[PDB]
Write a protein that binds this ligand. Structure first.
Ligand SMILES: Nc1ncnc2c1ncn2[C@@H]1O[C@H](COP(=O)(O)O)[C@@H](O)[C@H]1O
Ligand SMILES: Nc1ncnc2c1ncn2[C@@H]1O[C@H](COP(=O)(O)O)[C@@H](O)[C@H]1O
Ligand SMILES: Nc1ncnc2c1ncn2[C@@H]1O[C@H](COP(=O)(O)O)[C@@H](O)[C@H]1O
Lengths: 529, 529, 529
């Protein structure tokens, strides 16, 4: 690559080595396991670069990671892209068959896998062709990653290349035949960091991330860069605490003992934290959770506001950076009582800097922002995936009409608040994972005696939504719900179906509502059953 | 495309409309269903081109076909490539999950599916995204293909384009994680036709295909262009008989009633034909079967030679056109008795025109053709797939060292006869389908109590090879063969495993042979169990 | 050249070293002079490559050959193109001035000339500028070619280059001002070999060339690659006999003693062979002459059929590969008596694989194939010369309207038989050489007393056609035919006119038929005189 130093490229190395602030004695904490300053973190990143170079990782290679939220994942967020390689983040919560498919599709060269994820590998390790090396990670001195790092020097000259080289990739299981691969460049990640820092750092007094915070993620960190927050924290040079496996009690202990002030999670985790008996004698009045999983319910928001938690909601998705919207309260709205506060904080929010976010109908006609008309959201931003990896038709359907199609139906108020009414599909979302209703319909239709199977979604608190199934039996056929539940469970036991179908809650009916054309009225069915 | 008429492009339309011979009143026979001359066949091809154009099929589209050997498949072999589209041939004998994977990978626009293959579709139809239209085929006047054709004119001006545009694609399930996609161009298919016609038409008196033959395939016709034979027959303008579903009695009736003289099959089908009671009072002394499935056994060859059948063997594979080698007997060898004849006719044969076929060791060192030294076969020819579709690492391993790696270990005599000794892997091949030993090993290792599972292959006549499994039980564990057989069968019942594992024949042992390094001695195990 | 081994190039080296069959102990016979197997032939080709490289022949050079049909010419057909050089084949039957013109036009670097062609060189050797070396060939151990070969090793690594590099060139004296240069590429020659092998090898029982034949050419071998037959024979690995100079008695002796079964000649040579007294006590019932010079007469065909000779006719020309058409008899026509057989075998035949061959009028309007309407033949094939070397206007007239214009007027039957009625010009063809009527007209018009000279052609058996001249004398002028015959002969004695004018047969007349416009009615004159 011809440098031309006057021509500046936006790279992740500039994010690490040209931060907003850098205190060499600020800490990085891995829960009750490890602690080390920022200077040793930089040294470790350079050592990891040396180790990867020794392993034979070139500028076009892919390194896949499968582990929990820890300092090692933070080191991988930086070392692998800075060498010019591609970081493939594996969703450990997918079924083994889907995990194997994503590994084969991405063509990973090296795999860094945690010890306790080894069983999942053991039932797919035979069918993996591209992988040359496995590095097994442990939480003790026995870790292979740690032994690899300590054989290397803390010196390394990181290359400079084009800012449009791909940095990260991960696979979204949004309803389709197979998982789809998204990817982002160095430029896009740097611009996402800068834009969101501009948006949420400049807020007057509420819901701001600044250089005095202490950050602890509660998002799995293989889900779209942990909403980009680990990159931002490193940019601000703040104390970072990584909990590892999510356990409510140890999480609360970390919050108390480390004085965490900024976190992000999904509604289920927040509900679990609030329902824990250990969370009654704690001081929560310094904490700034951002809820972005799905549809922060107003009841949970009110329950959190009485604990003195600055809870606000945000909107994004796998294809969008992810962050697209955040709720910011004006100083007049900061003095409303708890009910109106809960109503405002549970909206999807206003769009962030450099985002367009129109609302459109099926003919690509921009609807008015009158506050009640609904349509699909279409966006333009500096950090959107241009297409799906190794895909053409779905890529064209993603960017139809010159805009990125989110797949969510919402209405936009006069001031700019966005409220998502539904999806453009009849799909379910159990907790933070995607599950397809059509696939469950087919699996249940493969039963011995089934007339019509239609799967709809019903709301929930510990899960957000449950995949209700409605089955009509054949002539003189009588099978209990246990039979069909076990039949569906058998598929999950083979690694075909994700574990989120373990609470399917099937229901036997005899009449199926159908439209004038005859299509199953899933909205009417939801209002019925 | 700029034509430049002086610049000649090798296209399949030139194969259809510039044949070696064209008799407008020669017949095309679909067994007991339909008969029509070559003139109506040309008219039907033009009508099918018109119908595909009306459906919106452009020059880059893919049309997938899923049916039996019939006149419709022959029409698809010509119409779809001539329009410039790509013909994806679906292997109906793969598991539904593999079929769905191949459909999604190839991104088919239209699917032409037979009526009796509908159930397989019904359990994957939900997870198909790219397909816009299904055409259901039947053997009566109710067929949708027939109704589509009769609404169109018999006039069409076929385009001329570059000869390097892709014509056909199909997926090989040779041992890997997922099926691999091969593809060929118009030029490659035309050159394969011309080269094999030159090789087998110029033979003096034995095993030749000429303009007076009557041709009937017994290869499924979705397996690598039916060895290219339907293209050759059309070039020679000979009578063609298509049997449909392979049933030994109806096949024998067609052979007798239509006076078939040239066919190709795999050893299993030939064994079934010879073992049929209807095949004792028939005159087989005009028939020229080519056996190319795998390792034509000498006993079957002798049994066929006593019926006055000109049986000879050939060698090819999915990546190679397929044809690479054919056995041709010199007039001195035509007077040997039945035993030496059977020995010679069962070899893999000499290479065909324009084929190189060296024998090499693991360091790419060309071994001598002394007749006993063995090595892997590496080939160069005008009709080899340049790589696997949407694949990089396996593509590089396929063409390592500038030659195509077959994966078969053989030795070459002084005169040029090739004899395949084994594979470069421990893989099984039940009848004409590929089955992976490693995947079965993993599935069985997922059992409640298993110590070591190793799968080897043992020979057979009705199947060619059976996938023997050797399982060592855990401490104080005793499970019968029925348990493990049913456990494996359950996976097949879910569409995960191919039906060729229904004769696994597991075996319980307590000692596993291991090398000095410790690897399971699969050859020693085969000699043991 | 960048090889890219997956990208296959069609080269003549692949024709020699990847044949249909290769028997190392098959013979090559040079009549009563030399015999050597195929292994020594390959060694000799490599030695000749080494010698040419030593002489300084690069990839763009031209080597010209002037000798008889022998093993050396066969070696030149392979060695020179395989080195990447261009083989210029000199027509030794042209006048010395025309030979010199072709040598200067082609710009040959080296000339390989036979001893007995030395006198022709001696009267033009002064005016040759480009030539650097002459190699004199003899039929004994004194030959310079033989001495050059034996100083070299039998090892050589032949290059691989683009398949569109020119391989051969030769000059056609079809009626024009000067001879025109045609040329073909490696790809075109390989495709001509494959296509004609497919066409004539797949015939059922009549007129087929197969691997058991013994081949002996009777075409001068500098006339358009000897119709491509030496390349085909080498591909089949058959015994090849080269007679040298054509003498009927030695040719018959070779046929008898070597058991020749396949040959090609022009009608004059066949007539001479049949009229020889030595040809009355011979067994001709194994021989398969192909007659392709011009218009095989039915009387000669009948006379040959009574000797049990499989005589059939073919059609081609210098610009067309040459082969365009061959007569193939269906098994129903094989049982007709001698008269209908003679009628069928004397037609020009049906077109070969990959040939289009329309019939057209002067406005490029495709006439119907009703069997009586006549028009010029226009062709498309994979082995046509794209243009004339170093020529623009004649090149454009050759490919006018997107088709190659043959210059022959024919009609095409319903089944596809082509019958050539005449030429599009008033040109003569004495035996196998072209002679221009306009040039003879001018030469005779240069006489002391001439009013109108018009040259027409009349048929013949020992010559096929004689160049009749009709001369009208001036007022009170009386010169005998001897005077004008000697005047014309004087020009031939100076090397200006070809020797085919030695039987001009001038005729003195007084009235010239003229059309309504006034043009000489050459057809009416032919019916008159
Ligand atoms: N703040 C939110 N409010 C409502 N739905 C949300 C919110 N954040 C995410 N979602 C939903 O969760 C989905 C994320 O799925 P994905 O990123 O594609 O893996 C989005 O497409 C939304 O439908
Ligand atoms: N004539 C033969 N003799 C031995 N093995 C054969 C023969 N024809 C095919 N095979 C085997 O069958 C395989 C075909 O598998 P494929 O074409 O990849 O789908 C080849 O790779 C060979 O291993
Ligand atoms: N089988 C044939 N029947 C009639 N004319 C022929 C036949 N073969 C060649 N010719 C004629 O001989 C000519 C060959 O001249 P050329 O190849 O240009 O040197 C052709 O153009 C035809 O006119």
């Amino acid at each position: 690559y011809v440098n031309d130093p006057s021509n500046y490229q936006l790279l992740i190395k500039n994010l690490l080595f040209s931060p907003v602030a850098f205190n060499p004695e600020q800490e990085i904490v891995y829960a009750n396991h490890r602690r080390h300053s920022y200077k040793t973190f930089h040294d470790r990143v350079r050592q990891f670069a040396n180790a990867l170079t020794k392993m034979g990782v070139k500028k076009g290679d892919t390194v896949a990671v499968m582990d929990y939220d820890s300092h090692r994942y933070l080191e991988c967020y930086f070392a692998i892209p800075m060498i010019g390689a591609k970081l493939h983040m594996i969703n450990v919560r997918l079924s083994p068959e889907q995990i194997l498919y994503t590994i084969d599709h991405a063509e990973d060269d090296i795999i860094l896998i945690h010890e306790e994820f080894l069983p999942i590998l053991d039932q797919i390790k035979g069918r993996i062709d591209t992988v040359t090396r496995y590095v097994v990670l442990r939480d003790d001195e026995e870790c292979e990653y740690e032994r690899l790092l300590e054989q290397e020097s803390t010196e390394y000259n990181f290359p400079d290349f084009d800012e449009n080289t791909v940095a990260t990739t991960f696979y979204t299981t949004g309803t389709t035949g197979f998982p789809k691969g998204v990817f982002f460049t160095h430029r896009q990640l740097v611009l996402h960091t800068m834009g969101i820092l501009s948006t949420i750092g400049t807020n007057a007094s509420q819901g701001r991330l600044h250089q005095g915070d202490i950050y602890m993620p509660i998002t799995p960190m293989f889900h779209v860069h942990a909403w980009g927050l680990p990159y931002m924290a490193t940019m601000l040079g703040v104390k970072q605490v990584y909990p590892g496996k999510y356990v409510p009690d140890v999480l609360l202990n970390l919050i108390e003992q480390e004085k965490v002030t900024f976190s992000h999670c999904v509604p289920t985790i927040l509900h679990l934290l609030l329902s824990s008996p250990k969370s009654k004698a704690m001081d929560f009045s310094g904490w700034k959770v951002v809820i972005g999983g799905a549809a922060l319910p107003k009841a949970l928001c009110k329950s959190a506001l009485e604990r003195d938690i600055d809870v606000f909601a945000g909107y994004g998705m796998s294809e969008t950076g992810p962050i697209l919207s955040i709720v910011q309260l004006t100083p007049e709205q900061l003095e409303l009582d708890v009910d109106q506060q809960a109503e405002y904080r549970s909206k999807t929010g206003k769009k962030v800097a450099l985002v367009e976010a129109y609302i459109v109908d099926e003919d690509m006609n921009k609807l008015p922002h009158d506050g009640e008309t609904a349509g699909e959201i279409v966006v333009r931003a500096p950090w959107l995936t241009p297409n799906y990896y190794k895909d053409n038709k779905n890529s064209k359907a993603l960017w139809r009409g010159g805009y990125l199609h989110t797949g969510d139906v919402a209405h936009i108020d006069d001031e700019g608040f966005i409220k998502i009414t539904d999806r453009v599909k009849d799909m379910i979302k159990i907790s933070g994972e995607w599950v397809s209703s059509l696939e469950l319909e087919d699996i249940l239709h493969q039963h011995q005696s089934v007339s019509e199977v239609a799967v709809i979604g019903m709301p929930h608190n510990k899960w957000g939504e449950v995949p209700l199934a409605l089955v009509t039996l054949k002539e003189d056929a009588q099978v209990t719900e246990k039979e069909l539940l076990g039949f569906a469970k058998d598929f999950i036991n083979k690694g075909i179906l994700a574990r989120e179908a373990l609470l399917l809650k099937v229901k036997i009916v005899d009449e199926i509502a159908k439209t004038s054309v005859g299509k199953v009225d899933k909205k009417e069915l939801r209002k019925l059953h």
